[PDB]
Each structure stands twice: as C-alpha cells, then as structure tokens.
Amino acid sequence: ADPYDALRRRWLGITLGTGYDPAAEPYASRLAETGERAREHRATMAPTPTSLWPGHPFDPPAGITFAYGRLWTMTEAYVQEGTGATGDPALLADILRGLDHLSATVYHPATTRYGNWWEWQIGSPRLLMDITAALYDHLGADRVAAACAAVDHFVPDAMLGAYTGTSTGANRVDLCRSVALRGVLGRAPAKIALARDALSPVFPYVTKGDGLYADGSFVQHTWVAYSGTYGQVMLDGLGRLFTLLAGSEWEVTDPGRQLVLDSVEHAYAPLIHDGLVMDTVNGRAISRGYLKSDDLHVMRSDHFHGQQLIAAMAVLAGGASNAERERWHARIKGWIERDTVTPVLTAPQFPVADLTRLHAIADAPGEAAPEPVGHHLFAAMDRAVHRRPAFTAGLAMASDRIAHYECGNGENPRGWHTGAGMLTWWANGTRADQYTDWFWPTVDWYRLPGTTVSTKRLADRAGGEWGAPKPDVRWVGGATDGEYAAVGQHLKGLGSTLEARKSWFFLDDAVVCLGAGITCADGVPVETVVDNRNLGEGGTQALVRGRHWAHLEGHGGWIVPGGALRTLREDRTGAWSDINTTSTTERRTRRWQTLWLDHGTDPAGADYVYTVMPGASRAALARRAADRHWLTVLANDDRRQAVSVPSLGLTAANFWQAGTAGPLTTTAGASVLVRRRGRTATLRVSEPPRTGEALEIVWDHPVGAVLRADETVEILATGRRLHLRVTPGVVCTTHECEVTLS
Numbered sequence: 001a002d003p004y005d006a007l008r009r010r011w012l013g014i015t016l017g018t019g020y021d022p023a024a025e026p027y028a029s030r031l032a033e034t035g036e037r038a039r040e041h042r043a044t045m046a047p048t049p050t051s052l053w054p055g056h057p058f059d060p061p062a063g064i065t066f067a068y069g070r071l072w073t074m075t076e077a078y079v080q081e082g083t084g085a086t087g088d089p090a091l092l093a094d095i096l097r098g099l100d101h102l103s104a105t106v107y108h109p110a111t112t113r114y115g116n117w118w119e120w121q122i123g124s125p126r127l128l129m130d131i132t133a134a135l136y137d138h139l140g141a142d143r144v145a146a147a148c149a150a151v152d153h154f155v156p157d158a159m160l161g162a163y164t165g166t167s168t169g170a171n172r173v174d175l176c177r178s179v180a181l182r183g184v185l186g187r188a189p190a191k192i193a194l195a196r197d198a199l200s201p202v203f204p205y206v207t208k209g210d211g212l213y214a215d216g217s218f219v220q221h222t223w224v225a226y227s228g229t230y231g232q233v234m235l236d237g238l239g240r241l242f243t244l245l246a247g248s249e250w251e252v253t254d255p256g257r258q259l260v261l262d263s264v265e266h267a268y269a270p271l272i273h274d275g276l277v278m279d280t281v282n283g284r285a286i287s288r289g290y291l292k293s294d295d296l297h298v299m300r301s302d303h304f305h306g307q308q309l310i311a312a313m314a315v316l317a318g319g320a321s322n323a324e325r326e327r328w329h330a331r332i333k334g335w336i337e338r339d340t341v342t343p344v345l346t347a348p349q350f351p352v353a354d355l356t357r358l359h360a361i362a363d364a365p366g367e368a369a370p371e372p373v374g375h376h377l378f379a380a381m382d383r384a385v386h387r388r389p390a391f392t393a394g395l396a397m398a399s400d401r402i403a404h405y406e407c408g409n410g411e412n413p414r415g416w417h418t419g420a421g422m423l424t425w426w427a428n429g430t431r432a433d434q435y436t437d438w439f440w441p442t443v444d445w446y447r448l449p450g451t452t453v454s455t456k457r458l459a460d461r462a463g464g465e466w467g468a469p470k471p472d473v474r475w476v477g478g479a480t481d482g483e484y485a486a487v488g489q490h491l492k493g494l495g496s497t498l499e500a501r502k503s504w505f506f507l508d509d510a511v512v513c514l515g516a517g518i519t520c521a522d523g524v525p526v527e528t529v530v531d532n533r534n535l536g537e538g539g540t541q542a543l544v545r546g547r548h549w550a551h552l553e554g555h556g557g558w559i560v561p562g563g564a565l566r567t568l569r570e571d572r573t574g575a576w577s578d579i580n581t582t583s584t585t586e587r588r589t590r591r592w593q594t595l596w597l598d599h600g601t602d603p604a605g606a607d608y609v610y611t612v613m614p615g616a617s618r619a620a621l622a623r624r625a626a627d628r629h630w631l632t633v634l635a636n637d638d639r640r641q642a643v644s645v646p647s648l649g650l651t652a653a654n655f656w657q658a659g660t661a662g663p664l665t666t667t668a669g670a671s672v673l674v675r676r677r678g679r680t681a682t683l684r685v686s687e688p689p690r691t692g693e694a695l696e697i698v699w700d701h702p703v704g705a706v707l708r709a710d711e712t713v714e715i716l717a718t719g720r721r722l723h724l725r726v727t728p729g730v731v732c733t734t735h736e737c738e739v740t741l742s
Ligand SMILES: CC(=O)N[C@@H]1[C@@H](O[C@@H]2O[C@H](C(=O)O)C[C@H](O)[C@H]2O)[C@H](O)[C@@H](CO)O[C@H]1O
Pocket: 118, 123, 229, 230, 233, 285, 308, 409
C-alpha cells in the first residue's frame, strides 16, 4: 500500500516540483502557458484509427509518443495550480479519452512493434507512466493495469537483461525508468528490484564501447563521442531514479553509483562553457534546431543542450555529499551568471520543477565559480578541451575507435567532416553564440573550422549511419600536463583517398596547428580550413590582413602566410530542414568569414603551419606574427611534428613513428611534452597508437637527479641526458617523470 504510494508521491515531487510559489515569476507565466497549450491540445484532439492529433499518424511511431506528450501537457494543466485548468473535469475527461484511444488503437499488447524501437520502449512508456502516476486515483484499476501490461509488452524483463544492443548506457537507464514506475504503479516489487539491479552495469568505467571511461570520456552507439546529449539523458535518468528510490526497499546501493557522481566534474563539467555543452559531443543533435514536433518552439543548440545538462546536475546534487553539492552548485551559479545567450533561470524548455531547482541554487549562499584554466584530453573519445584567460576551444578528431560522425533518423546528413580535426572556439568574455546562432543550418559543410578535407562532393549520409564510418588509423591522441598539450590526428578523410598528419599544440594564448604528409588522389583540390566564423546576420566585423596574419574584429586572429591564405566573406541562407528531416523549414541568412589554404589537386606530401589566437587583439597578432623568437617549428613532416616555445619552457612533439625532433628521441610512435621551470623539468609521455609496447625516450638536456617518476617509467640514465623506458598501456595515459636540471 503505503511504500508504493510513498514512491508515487516522491516521483510526482521530482516531476512536478515542490516548494515554489505559483503566483511568483517565472512559475506563474510558465504554468499559465501550460494551460494555454493544454487548451489548444484539447480543442484539436481528434481520434482516428491511425492518429490522435491531425498531422501525427501512429506510423511512424513518433506520432504515438507525440500524442502521449500532448496528454502529459494536458495532465500538467489539470494537476498543477496556476494553469487556468486546474481540476477541470472536462479536461480530465479528454485526457482519459485520449489515453483510452491510444490503448485501443496502438499502444497495446496485440501490436507488433514497427519502426523506431525508441518510440515504443522509451518515448511513449515514460510518458504513459508519468501520466498514470499523476492521474492515478482518477484512472481506475483497469486503466492502470492496462498501462502496466503495455509496458510489460514493449519493455519485457529481457530488455533489462543482457547489457547489450539497445540496452546499454543512456538507453538502459531510460528503460529502467519505465520499468521502475511500472513497478510502483502496478505494486510489483519484483519490477522495481529489476529496474534497480539493472542500473548496475551502467556504472563501471569501460574500456571499449558505450559508457564512461576512466579519462572522463563518454561514448554511445559504440563509436560516437556523446557526453552532451546521451550523457545528459543518462545523468538525468540516474538523478531521477536515485532520488526516487532513496530510503526505499529498492534504494540504489551499488558503490559504482559514486562513479556517476564523480563524472559530474570529471566528465561533464569540462565540456560546458558559459552555459553551452560543446557541439563536438552532441553528435547528430547539432542538426536539430527548431523541431517540427516541439510545441514550445525552443531552438536546440549547444546552449539548449548545456542547459539540460545543468538541470540534470541539479537533480543529481540532491543525493551528493555536502562537499560535492557545494562544488557543483558553485559551478552552476557561475554558468548561470555567464550564460547571456539563453538565460538559464528563464529557459523556455524548463518546466516548473527544473525552474525551482535552479532558482534554489541561484538563491543559495555561495560564490559563482569561474571555469578553471586548464586542458582536458578526453582520449578515449578523441576530444580535447582547452581553457585559457583569453579563450575556450574544443577539438574533434576521429579514429578506428571514434566515428567521423553520426547520422541517423534523418538527422545530420552532412556532418562528414566534423571529426576531421575540427577546432571550435570562443573568445572569453564575449557572447558565446558562435555555434548557436544559426551556424549549422547555414555553414558550408565542406569548410568546417580547423579541418583538412578533399573538396570531393559527398552524398548525404556518406559512410553510413550510427557511427559506421571510422578512419582506418590508430595514432589519434596526445599528451597533456593538465595545462598545455600536444595533440595529433592521423587523418583519413571520409569517402576520400585523403591522408594527412595534423597536430595541435595548445599553449597559453594560442593553438599552433601543423599539417604534413597531405596526400590525395581524388583528382580535385584539397583544402585546410584556417577558420570559418559565423558573423551573425548582416555582420560587419572588420577583417584586417597583414603580411603573415589576419584578424577578425570581435573574434581573434591567425598567423598564416598572407599570400597563401584565401578568404571569402559571404551570406549563406539555410533552414534546419536542410540538415534534419524533423526540423522546421524556415530560412534565415547568416554572414560568414571563411579562411583556407588550397593544397592543389592531388597533393603529395603537402604541409601547413598556422597559429590561431582566439580572443587576441589586432596589435597582439601583428606582434606575434613579426616575432621570430617565440616559436620554433622543430619538425613538420609525416614522421614527426614538434615545436619549441621558450616562453613556456616547452618542447612538444608528436612522433608518428620512431625518430627524433629537436632534443627528443623516441623508439616508437608517442606524444611527448617537456616543461622546464627554473631548476627542474617535467617530462610527459603518451602512446597514442595504443600498442602497449614499451618504448624509450631520450631528452637531450643535462639532468642531475630524478625527483619522481610514475611506476610505468623506468629511468635508464641521467647525466648528460635523460633516458627513460616507458610501459605505456593501451589507453593513451600520459606518464610523468620530474627531474632536477644540471
Ligand atoms: C540523446 C538523443 O538524441 N536521443 C534521441 C531523442 O532526443 C532526446 O529526447 C529526450 C526526451 O526526453 O524525449 C531528451 C533529449 O534532450 C533529446 O536529445 C529523440 O527524441 C528520439 C526520437 O527521435 O531519438 C533519441 O535517439
């Protein structure tokens, strides 16, 4: 009786929110709008054998989930104060009418599932369980049993079996959501126990496939970097279920739960910049924008996705330690302060429950935390994040482990080169709307920023769906001290015969970008995209050019040979429906500044060097471009790419095979960063080929003593030089050694 009723009440608190004043803004307007939607839904609801609302047939099954969604809105209007429809028996009759129609015509145990599994096993049942919970006492026993038997039919015990296929990660968590509630609502303790127990395989760190990795990476669909959308769905579901079940017979007690809590700062926080979650980790969702089925008309975007992740963090914080909660709330206060693009505290997709959690954080005592300066190399998902005072940057690569891109379900048909060394960035202290402001629906998908590509025309969905296309390469990764980094990609171009070695050296106010071994036989030109910047509608930002640099007002600049650099400023018009079959067709115009190098047709061993200085002033760029001292390119070929930056005491090298660059030598493919600081230095080494075979490094500098070394590092010699043997493992860990200089 009572433990099932207690669980149902707890769920409704989580879902519909508690401890807010319905007459206070933003709650009052949000509730009122929910009443407005509910009244239009009610008036248009039109039951037929094949739909419940016009334009939304049950085949494809998206129409079923869409109908349950409108029924949930209707149910919110009925159960919440302030909606204009609270307790209206006419509205209640129409909800029950819709529910009965769905149960009679489509969502029932005689149906053999067709089309997208997700609609039947995740979209629809979670909504059906929510509506069943909220209306429980009005529905009667036959409606509740009917709902429970639909869920048993579409999500049978065997789905929360084997940790495989469609029952992994974010998906597993979503399945457990419906089975848990089905257990609560149907008073079926075994179903609740099964949902709790089935979460356990979600928690451990993984070394392959879907899940969280030790290095903070998050992978879904086997091969797709996905922290920003799937990872948010996992976090959301987990937070909700942890909160629901706490104190009950079915509380989640697995100690691996703690790894989920750890992931907040290790995995997710680094990818959030002033409210946005970087598009590098949003997979096919970058293409959504305005969705035709979204009755709130809220644009999907990096900021939209970041705000959903922030909301998930707020729910998870409720079961965290005091110390964890305090840190997460400070981060969240900071993202709230700095998000000027989509103000978190009035975000239009948040229902009142999310609003109340976020407002509680904003109102609590505590300081808003800045994003720390530092580097995060998520090697397991081939992503890097760099933060400096002047800028934030995200890099996307691809490898034999990590797909070039994800297309599927009509989404992201032209994202082919999102993994071709794509460097995204934001100038700190300016509005963070670069990628948000109709970027994806207007961009030239042949000229993504940072990438090297064949100009060969590609089909929509070229390479296959769901992360099918991976380049046939191993050496993708890098080495980092947590501040600076050497990062490298052995690139094989999607649908092309292009091969290249690209490297990035992330420094204190710049990213030095090296390209070598650029070879193609496609019979068309090959380009490297120095940058490609959305200027907004009607942009008039000045582009100023010099001998060996270019600068874009409000953005930053590039050190690059001025006679080689090609530039185009143009207006481009597009719609989200160009890149998503589920999106709206309205067309808008954005102005672009595009900068590239042309390697000609069928290059053989072509190369480039350029430096990007995001957020820099025109004078800073001019000075740096004229300064011969600050950077030495030690090597740039298909064997080794390496730099020296004396102002940082830094030598960094990506060794594509055994060899030497400046003062460093390696016996195998490796990434090496050395930092000298006064009388000591730190050497860091990783092995991006991931063979796990030992290799030796020599650093040609006098070294007196070894202060410390990781257990993976053996010291073979000190004196005139440092000679180390490293056993590097198979996950591209950076190993360290710290020595005193002579
Ligand atoms: C992670 C993802 O792309 N999932 C999609 C799904 O979209 C998600 O919808 C959920 C939701 O609660 O309904 C929230 C999340 O923010 C969003 O990305 C999409 O609706 C379905 C059907 O197309 O497919 C999943 O793969």
